[PDB]
């Protein structure tokens, strides 16, 4: 149904602005809010239908100590949204405490938007893990949202902070945030900073301006993830029906994404399926094996070729995953959007549950434990101090993420009747 | 509904009973013990019966005509009668 977006963190507000700009360009919308002259397709999930058919984006921007919001302010696209949903230290506990005291008015804004919406389906989160101000306050808001609304869905888009080092206290912050994400979120879309950075340095020749490109990448991914809802077909035109297949168990809810063209500015679907199963098209980094794989195709498709392609790729066994049970690949189809020039119009997406990200989490589990053992890297922050004088919440999150890694490695085994 | 004879031929009584009521009730400002109540009871039963009958005959094919039934049908009063 109707989904409200929340955006917080500097990179999160960047990709939210880019996402809304991308959808305004994608649909028949002017940057004033007015419907375009040449506008069939649904805008009834993320866009409020206002008085002059003004598709006002259903978005709530949360920030504290604004810097980039001023750059949002002086824009022609500052008249598309902001019906006054904008509300004005780099520690987790700092942002937690600051969000604690102003929980009421921002929750009042959320309830205001819930009253403004006729229906409700979910709150999708734009998040940056260990982004400083975004950390802690984002976990706090996630806990509040799970508390107040036990009937709605929570989706999280976030990047995982790895740049091969910087901040000595960020693994603690990301560990607490991951503990909150495991318990207080329903489904998590995971992203890696170094992987997207490497792809940006790969297909292009940039080294510094990675933000401006990665915004485009995440915007394309997120819009692709929502296209079958935005452009109505009839397979999984609800969020919940899509998410139900992707989550095999409530302990594994992290989703790996790709994108079939690394650059799209006339191959068949058979080729790009083979491309997508190659890991260079995969944008998120014993044997690691998928549990369940889904793919979504949008382009110029012949309907017989997808069947024979599934036959041939099935027989070729390019799906290097061994499950513990009956779970298999799932196909889906979406519409190519108008008004956008696309060479090689076939474009696909993948949503798969893969165990390999456990190793990435294990990297942080190694790092944090190392800095815990030497104990010269907690640095004695005061917000961390009165929030927890004994710092046993870090031990609690360490317990949870250990259980999580064990659940991962039990899922790697060909039986999940045994647990980890 | 003038072209349809039964519904016409009961709405006539629906008007006539209100005329008899309005004439009768204005007569005495004290209570009717002079058999005004005797006719009034007859009028009450016949009014309920006639209204239910015409409503059942009526239930033309226009949106507003379908609309005006349902306000009386809020509690199915003439339909539980």
């Amino acid at each position: 149904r109707e989904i409200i977006t929340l955006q917080l963190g500097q990179c999160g507000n960047q990709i939210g602005f880019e996402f809304w700009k991308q959808l305004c360009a994608e649909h028949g919308i002017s940057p004033e809010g007015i419907v375009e002259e040449f506008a069939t397709d649904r805008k009834d999930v993320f866009f409020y239908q206002a008085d002059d058919e003004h598709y006002i984006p259903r978005a709530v921007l949360l920030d504290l100590e604004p810097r980039v919001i001023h750059s949002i302010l002086n824009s022609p696209y500052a008249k598309l949204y902001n019906p006054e949903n904008i509300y004005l230290g780099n520690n987790w506990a700092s942002g937690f405490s600051q969000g604690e005291k102003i929980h009421e008015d921002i929750f009042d804004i959320i309830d205001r938007e819930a009253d403004g919406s006729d229906s409700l389906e979910g709150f999708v989160l734009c998040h940056s893990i260990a982004g400083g101000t975004g950390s802690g306050l984002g976990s706090y808001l996630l806990e509040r949202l799970n508390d107040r609304y036990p009937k709605k869905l929570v989706q999280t888009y976030s990047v995982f902070p790895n740049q091969d080092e910087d901040v000595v206290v960020q693994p603690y912050n990301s560990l607490l945030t991951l503990k909150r994400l495991t318990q207080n979120a329903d489904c998590v879309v995971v992203l890696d900073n170094t992987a997207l950075n490497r792809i940006a340095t790969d297909r292009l020749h940039i080294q510094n301006p990675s933000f401006s490109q990665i915004n485009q990448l995440v915007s394309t991914i997120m819009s692709a993830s929502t296209t079958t809802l935005r452009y109505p077909g009839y397979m999984n035109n609800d969020l919940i029906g899509l998410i139900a297949s992707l989550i095999p168990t409530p302990r594994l809810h992290f989703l790996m994404t790709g994108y079939t063209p690394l650059t799209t500015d006339k191959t068949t679907v058979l080729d790009v399926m083979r491309r997508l199963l190659q890991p260079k098209n995969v944008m998120v980094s014993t044997n690691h094996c998928y549990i369940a794989i889904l793919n979504i195709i949008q382009g110029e498709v012949d309907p017989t070729q997808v069947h024979k392609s599934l036959q041939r790729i099935r027989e070729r066994k390019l799906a290097n995953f061994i499950p513990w049970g009956p779970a298999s690949i799932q196909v889906a189809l979406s519409r190519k959007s108008p008004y956008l020039p696309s060479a090689h119009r076939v474009s696909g997406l993948m949503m798969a549950n893969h165990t390999s990200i456990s190793s990435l989490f294990e990297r942080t589990c190694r790092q944090y434990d190392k800095l815990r053992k030497r104990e010269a890297f907690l640095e004695q922050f005061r917000k961390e101090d009165m929030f927890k004088d004994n710092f046993d919440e870090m031990d609690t999150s360490r317990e949870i993420v250990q259980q999580l890694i064990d659940e991962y490695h039990a899922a790697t085994r060909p039986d999940y009747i045994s647990w980890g | 509904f003038i072209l349809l004879k039964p519904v016409f031929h009961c709405l006539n009584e629906i008007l006539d009973l209100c005329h008899s009521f309005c004439s009768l009730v204005s007569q005495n400002l004290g209570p009717l013990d002079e058999r005004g109540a005797a006719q009034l009871s007859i009028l009450v039963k016949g009014f309920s019966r006639q209204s239910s009958l015409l409503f059942k005959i009526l239930s033309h094919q226009i949106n507003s005509d379908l609309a005006q039934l349902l306000l009386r049908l809020d509690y199915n009063k003439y339909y539980t009668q």
Binding site: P232, G233, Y234, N237, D238 | -
Partner: protein
């Protein structure tokens, strides 16, 4: 246009129609529509297409 629309009015939109029936009154469903075994179905056929579209086609 009628032919394409007919199989769009049964066989998206009808998913919302069935989720209401998931949780009686046949006129209730029409109002819910307009903005497991058994069921009744109905839709009017206009005459200039009724000379090609059959009544028994609706059954199949």
């Amino acid at each position: 246009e009628y032919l394409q629309a007919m199989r769009n009015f049964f066989l998206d939109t009808m998913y919302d129609f069935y989720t209401s029936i998931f949780d009686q009154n046949v006129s209730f469903l029409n109002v819910q529509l307009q903005e497991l075994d058994g069921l009744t179905l109905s839709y009017k056929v206009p005459w200039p297409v009724d000379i090609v579209i059959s009544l028994e086609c609706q059954k199949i």
